[PDB]
Design a protein around this ligand. Structure first.
Ligand SMILES: [Fe+3]
Length: 312
């Protein structure tokens, strides 16, 4: 028996976890790891001829794209239904969260006054004019942040916030989070918005000594309440090895599988915060209770309004 996994978790750090499942169960795991959007396009084109069984995707936005493209089938699993928090699954049981990440504020204390920064709203403060730097709007991460703001506050108030934030940006938009972290730790940017785990990975040396140096200079700020995003897995609509796929998903979503995945990328497990010392030090967070499904719903509107204010 085998199962075929097409995984959007393109970190090059998950193979160990599939090995554990293989030993424990005997089920052979055949694993492709690449860009999520490349997987979506391939599956649409292959259809009933695809050899995917289990699909894993990063970020609410891409999960929404796969769901709109009808890539998942509904599954029944007493375990998943009763172990995965409602806010991090499909209310219609086509996908299930596996790891949690936070999009957070980073800062350089020698450029800006951190005592004035608590939440995202604070970044419209005109004293930060010239000092704010962002990754571009093509990142699903960014789109999902803005979607979060629309869920709670509605479209009107989000625009106000966006105009005020983009007013303070005087630097070309970045193409990655990692390079945004450099610019903050170097001091050419005062403030950035990045995912937590990139700061932790760089602190831990994963990208060599210079980046580790630049990362030590930053002050990470977790907004309260926090915006939470996920990686998620679902069973392919035409999966040949359906039984095996569910089982593997059941394992990835358990405490062992979830910790396994999360510990590789410095993310938080599904039901409890990370035990990693570097991640722990960022401090404790509280989820704002916006559901991953809501983040999907408003992804369209978010990109509309992002373009309208000038977030390129
Ligand atoms: Fe990422």
């Amino acid at each position: 028996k085998e199962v075929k996994v097409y995984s959007g978790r393109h970190y090059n750090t998950d193979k160990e976890v599939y090995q554990k499942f293989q030993e424990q169960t005997g089920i052979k795991v055949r694993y492709i790891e690449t860009d999520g959007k490349a997987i979506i396009e391939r599956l649409k084109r292959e259809g009933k001829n695809s050899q995917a069984d289990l699909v894993i995707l990063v970020d609410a936005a891409i999960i929404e794209n796969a769901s709109k493209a009808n890539l998942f089938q509904k599954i029944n699993s007493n375990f998943l239904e009763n172990s995965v928090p409602n806010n991090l699954r499909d209310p219609r049981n086509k996908w299930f969260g596996l790891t949690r990440r936070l999009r957070v504020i980073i800062s350089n204390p020698d450029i800006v006054d951190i005592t004035k920064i608590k939440n995202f709203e604070d970044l419209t403060n005109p004293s930060f004019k010239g000092k704010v730097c962002l990754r571009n709007r093509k990142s699903p991460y960014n789109q999902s942040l803005v979607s979060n703001q629309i869920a709670k506050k509605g479209v009107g108030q989000t625009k106000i916030w966006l105009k005020g934030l983009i007013s303070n940006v005087s630097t070309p938009y970045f193409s990655g989070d990692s390079s945004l972290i450099r610019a903050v730790g170097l001091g050419t940017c005062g403030i950035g918005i990045v995912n937590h785990y990139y700061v932790a990975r760089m602190l831990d040396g994963v990208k060599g000594p210079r980046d580790a140096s630049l990362a030590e200079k930053i002050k990470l700020i977790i907004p309260n309440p926090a915006h939470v995003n996920i990686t998620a897995g679902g069973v392919y609509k035409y999966a040949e090895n359906k039984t095996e796929a569910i089982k593997l998903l059941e394992y990835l979503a358990s405490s062992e599988g979830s910790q396994g995945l999360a510990n590789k990328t410095y993310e938080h497990p599904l039901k409890e915060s990370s035990q990693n010392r570097i991640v722990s030090k960022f401090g404790d967070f509280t989820p704002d209770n916006v559901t991953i499904k809501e983040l999907g719903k408003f992804n369209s509107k978010a990109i509309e309004i992002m373009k309208e204010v000038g977030w390129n």
